[PDB]
Design a protein around this nucleic acid. Structure first.
Ligand code: MG
Ligand code: MG
Ligand code: MG
Ligand code: MG
Ligand code: MG
Ligand code: MG
Ligand code: MG
Ligand code: MG
Ligand code: MG
Ligand code: MG
Ligand code: MG
Ligand code: MG
Ligand code: MG
Ligand code: MG
Ligand code: MG
Ligand code: MG
Ligand code: MG
Ligand code: MG
Ligand code: MG
Ligand code: MG
Ligand code: MG
Ligand code: MG
Ligand code: MG
Ligand code: MG
Ligand code: MG
Ligand code: MG
Ligand code: MG
Ligand code: MG
Ligand code: MG
Ligand code: MG
Ligand code: MG
Ligand code: MG
Ligand code: MG
Ligand code: MG
Ligand code: MG
Ligand code: MG
Ligand code: MG
Ligand code: MG
Ligand code: MG
Ligand code: MG
Ligand code: MG
Ligand code: MG
Ligand code: MG
Ligand code: MG
Ligand code: MG
Ligand code: MG
Ligand code: MG
Ligand code: MG
Ligand code: MG
Ligand code: MG
Ligand code: MG
Ligand code: MG
Ligand code: MG
Ligand code: MG
Ligand code: MG
Ligand code: MG
Ligand code: MG
Ligand code: MG
Ligand code: MG
Ligand code: MG
Ligand code: MG
Ligand code: MG
Ligand code: ZN
Lengths: 98, 91
RNA sequence: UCGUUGCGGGUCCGCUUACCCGCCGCAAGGCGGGGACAGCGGCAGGCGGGCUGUUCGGCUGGGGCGGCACACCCCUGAAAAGAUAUCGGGGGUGCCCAAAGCUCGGCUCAGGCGGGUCAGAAAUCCGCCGUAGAGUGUAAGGGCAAAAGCCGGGCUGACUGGGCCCUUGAACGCAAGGGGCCCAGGCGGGAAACCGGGGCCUAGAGAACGCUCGUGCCCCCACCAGUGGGGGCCGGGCAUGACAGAAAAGUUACCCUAGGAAUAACCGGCUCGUCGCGGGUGAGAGUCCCCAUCGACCCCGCGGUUUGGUACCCAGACGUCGUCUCUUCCCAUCCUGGCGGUGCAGCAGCCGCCAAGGGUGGGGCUGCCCGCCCAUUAAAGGGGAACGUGAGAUGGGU
RNA sequence: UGAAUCCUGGCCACUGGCGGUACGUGAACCCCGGGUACAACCGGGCGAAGCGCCGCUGAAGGCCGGGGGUAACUGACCCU
RNA sequence: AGACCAAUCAAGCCCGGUGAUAGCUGGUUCCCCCCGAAGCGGGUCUCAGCCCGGCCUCCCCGGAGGCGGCCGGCGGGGUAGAGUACUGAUCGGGGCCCCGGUCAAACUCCGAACCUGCCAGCGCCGUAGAAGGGGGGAGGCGGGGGCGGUGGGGUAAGCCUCCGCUCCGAGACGGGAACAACCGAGACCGGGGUUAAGGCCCCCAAGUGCGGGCUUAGUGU
RNA sequence: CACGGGCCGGGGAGUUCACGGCCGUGGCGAGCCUAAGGGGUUCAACCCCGGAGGCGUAGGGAAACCGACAGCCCGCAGCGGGGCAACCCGCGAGGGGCGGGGUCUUAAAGGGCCCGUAGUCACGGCCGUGAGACCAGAAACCGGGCGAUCUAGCCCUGGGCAGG
RNA sequence: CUCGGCUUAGUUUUGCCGGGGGAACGCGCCGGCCACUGGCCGGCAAGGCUAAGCACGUCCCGAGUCCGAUAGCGCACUAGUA
RNA sequence: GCGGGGAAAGGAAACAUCUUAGUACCCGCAGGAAGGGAAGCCAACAGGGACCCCCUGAGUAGGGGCGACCGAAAGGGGGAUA
RNA sequence: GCCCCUAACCCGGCCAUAGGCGCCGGUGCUACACCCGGUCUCAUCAGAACCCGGAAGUUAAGGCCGGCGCCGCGCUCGGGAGUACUGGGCUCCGCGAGGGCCCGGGAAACCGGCGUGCUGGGAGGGGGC
């Protein structure tokens, strides 16, 4: 049978957590005030999966373009296409490589 | 699923929340002077086969629950669907 | 049923000229009977393969039957970015819920232990332990402990009008559906923060035309105005499950057309599960004694002599079973030659080895092949050759 | 159906045919009511055949099993 | 007997509609030069067709960056292995626990090689024009070979169905005894030279070459 | 061991129109071109007339109805300045972006479409759709006519069948 | 006017044929994209004729970037012949 | 040329409404042409002024499984003019 | 007002080197607690809790600090081990499934050893400007 495509269709290992990381996650990622132009890493948090981006954007680096209420508008690429991710800071990390 | 017979719901005409009575939507009777109906009588006259398709195989088990909400103040009617499921029981 | 359909009388009775049926007459017309019925025309309902037109989907280890791998969702396959198929494996979906939805607060679950009238394994009570071993509507996977679970309070955001983004649909065109972040209007919970555009997350989903409903101090309808009616734009619904959407049953051996080795049947090719043949092992039998003769339980092989798997070649065509005729080849040897063993006294028998020069026949039964049987015999072996041989036959079967 | 000869059993549930009291349904026509200065339009009544319903028909198309057990295969038993 | 109706019958013949239609089949006519594919994804009463993208070609606008390679900085992952700790299976010893042992596509504390995102550099490409965009025309939408994922399935298959590099299709030539895809190698024409694979007793160009050892089976070459 | 051709000569297949897209050129240019037709001609040629009409110049909206730019920034070419050069600097058509405007929706915000110039007529080419549509190919279906010298059936009228 | 049917772009609105019904009169009647009402506008059906300017090619005349005896009409010829 | 009767194949990638097409074909009837022709018209409050044929309006209005496809008229320019 | 140093307290970050069991201590002017009552705000069956008002007592417990043993845990430590596995090339071995070689990377369990919260801001306390 051909692959089913749900919004989370091969996310067993991605969304699993180790025993030492069980429970609520720390709140330090809420306290990063990103400006336009800064680089961020999309790191999906499994405990807030309703607001998380798709699995294809895990581990990718984007550019903060702006804020929409409380989410951050992030510009990224998938191969060659320019994508616009609008996610809250709980699924982000700052990029320290440049 | 059970639904109440009255709810507190926003009214676009009144621009606020008013009491709304809940009823079941009933389709109107097709009138013979409708433009498509008049065209269908013209097609049905004269010789030939049955001139239009009539569905023979059906697949839906339930229809979408269409409910009618009437503002108790102005009479404004809102018709919302609750989704394809069995008939609700107004309670 | 409308008309033909008329004249009297009180829907009914009658009448004859209409009309119809026969007789006579060239015709003219007469006779008899029926009779405003019938018959005939129009319209309407029923029965109506008597006749006319058509449709009888797809995938597919050939077609068919089956299944739905045909629209979706989860895990695995999947090879630590992304993507990823098979009639691959384990499963589910076409719902359900006015609370199983929203918010606030309090509590802690399964299970175990100690004490406690009824009371008990288990009810209510007091305390200790208890990483979630519970619960979270529903598949699977994920998440969750002053919660996402349980209990209670207050509610309806399962809201109105809009925008942007993600996925379905990778990079890379392209529905519907689903999800996220927001702006405005008006609310609910809460001290507030904050949350609420259904269900903790990933499934439960439907174009055009047509109809219907809601909405607007709304637009249009042919010179002008008015009344009834109709149409329009925006939004919800009624459905196509073959789910990016025709309205649809068989049969053909009486069959026909266009093609196809993209695809079966015979032969051939590859493979050898099956079939035939060989070997290792030796529990056990054999009076004792594994191996004279066997050979459980298991294992390693060979042939292409059955049967299948596959679908590589051959559809403008390789004549489909058996038999007859005739030639040759293999040996894994039935007899004939040589040799050995024996549970070989003789007569016989059984087993192994070398050996393919010759032989291996006549009949009964069945279309057979095969198989069984009869009387003989040294014995009356088995296989290959386009299942040797139909431009040689035969034609019993298919 | 297929000379002649001896015979031709049970079943009308189904598929048909045919007949029938009532009742339900059942088209146009017609009638009533509403709407329309008139119509379109809308509701109702009446209501044929037929269908539903009731019977008849197998030398109409045809069909003709069981469950069992009991019983000293069952003559017989309950039937279902 | 679906017989026969002028050699014609499961519906005659003649002429006409009519050059019926045909996703199917056959054929499709001169030369040189430049570039140069595809059999993948989605939808389709779709599976021998067709449309939208990927792959090709030509023209134009645009204007300086680009990325099949590598190093580094900052990140992502959960495979091989490993383990038997969650979910399960599983053999023993000892007293529901402890110890040793056997396993896991639908188990995971650990966890590579590897791949991948951004930045900096190297490398190469680019102003004789990168990125990006517009217009025309398509072919094609049957693939196949080798190697690797014990890929997954199957007794196996020159078997079915996926993932990647390369080659054949569409590529001459040398070696392989012949032989599309195995090894070497990429061909404008003529000549000379040197090598690759492979070979050097004869067939056949080059060694009856060199040292040591083994084989008696013509095993093998 | 897939199918076609015995040989030779001659014949034998992308056409035309209409419409649409695009290209290469030519004319004119906020305009471009005439159609039918009319006059003349050395008479289908040619010269002249014919602007009806079509396309463009303004869009938005179902419709009623309403109805539009030189402001700013980046910047290739080009130009000017500097520099031995490398390069730097300024202006900067065309290009890109923002703003502003016309209109629709909404209560609004937001959002859709459009706006600061180029069209048109022609010739040649490519392609699409229809027309037979590169050439050849069905089995079929319908219309009007012909046939019972054969054969099937029946009717009218003749002939025939040794011998036992 | 109504019902059935063929046809037409004619659509609650083209034309006609058939079944049934069926006016008025110039103070009247007909049309102005559903029907009716009012206004306004335009007309007078159900009777007959009519040149010119337009289709065609047996036939005649002329022309041709047409074909040239397997071409061009089937026929260049004792061809619609044998 | 005029009146009447009247298909299918094919197309719609199946097919029935539909188209093909009022066509092929059939029956009847004329002329050198035929038919049409002299407002119960079109328009829109401004005006045209019998008819036919040509260019256009225009593949516009509209018809239609609103699919394939089908498809005017008024008006304007001409031939001719009664 | 300012810079510096510094316990127990308040607000955090990472979220076991931080957890769990047991043992031995230190801490009390201030701060943290236990604690004392229920008029008021507030709450329940219950002033237990929450909320309010307070200060007699107590370091008994909580908190914070120090030390030891065990379990758990962490480590860019040693062995395991250049092992298992792996990217590239091969006319190299094997009948074959498979293995070998060269170039480049490189674990895990387990064993031993070590470690058992670190740290940001404020209050209070000390110093100086
Ligand atoms: Mg797919
Ligand atoms: Mg949600
Ligand atoms: Mg009568
Ligand atoms: Mg009658
Ligand atoms: Mg039939
Ligand atoms: Mg069907
Ligand atoms: Mg099929
Ligand atoms: Mg099937
Ligand atoms: Mg992946
Ligand atoms: Mg809660
Ligand atoms: Mg899709
Ligand atoms: Mg894509
Ligand atoms: Mg759910
Ligand atoms: Mg869905
Ligand atoms: Mg008008
Ligand atoms: Mg589909
Ligand atoms: Mg094949
Ligand atoms: Mg075969
Ligand atoms: Mg065997
Ligand atoms: Mg033995
Ligand atoms: Mg075989
Ligand atoms: Mg072959
Ligand atoms: Mg052949
Ligand atoms: Mg032959
Ligand atoms: Mg032998
Ligand atoms: Mg053969
Ligand atoms: Mg044979
Ligand atoms: Mg023969
Ligand atoms: Mg032969
Ligand atoms: Mg026979
Ligand atoms: Mg009987
Ligand atoms: Mg028969
Ligand atoms: Mg015949
Ligand atoms: Mg016939
Ligand atoms: Mg014919
Ligand atoms: Mg090239
Ligand atoms: Mg083919
Ligand atoms: Mg890197
Ligand atoms: Mg493993
Ligand atoms: Mg293991
Ligand atoms: Mg990978
Ligand atoms: Mg394919
Ligand atoms: Mg391959
Ligand atoms: Mg090919
Ligand atoms: Mg060779
Ligand atoms: Mg030599
Ligand atoms: Mg040998
Ligand atoms: Mg062929
Ligand atoms: Mg031949
Ligand atoms: Mg065409
Ligand atoms: Mg037909
Ligand atoms: Mg006929
Ligand atoms: Mg005769
Ligand atoms: Mg000649
Ligand atoms: Mg000739
Ligand atoms: Mg045709
Ligand atoms: Mg068709
Ligand atoms: Mg057909
Ligand atoms: Mg005549
Ligand atoms: Mg005339
Ligand atoms: Mg005349
Ligand atoms: Mg027509
Ligand atoms: Zn209201």
């Amino acid at each position: 049978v051909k692959r089913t495509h749900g919004y989370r269709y091969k996310s067993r290992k991605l969304l699993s957590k180790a025993p030492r990381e069980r429970g609520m996650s720390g709140l330090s990622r809420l306290l990063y005030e990103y400006k336009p132009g800064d680089k961020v890493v999309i790191d999906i948090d499994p405990t807030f999966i309703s607001t998380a981006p798709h699995r294809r954007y895990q581990g990718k680096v984007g550019v903060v373009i702006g804020t929409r209420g409380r989410a951050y508008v992030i510009e990224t690429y998938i191969g060659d296409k320019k994508k616009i991710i609008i996610t809250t800071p709980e699924h982000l990390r700052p990029h320290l490589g440049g | 699923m059970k639904f109440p017979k009255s709810v507190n719901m926003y009214c676009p005409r009144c621009n606020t929340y008013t009491q709304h009575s809940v009823s079941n939507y009933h389709g109107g009777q097709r009138r013979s002077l409708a433009e498509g109906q008049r065209r269908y009588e013209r097609k049905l006259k004269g010789y030939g086969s049955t001139p239009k398709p009539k569905q023979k195989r059906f697949a839906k088990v339930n229809k979408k629950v269409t409910l009618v909400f009437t503002c108790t103040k102005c009479g404004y009617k809102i018709v919302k669907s609750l989704g394809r499921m069995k008939k609700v029981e107004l309670v």
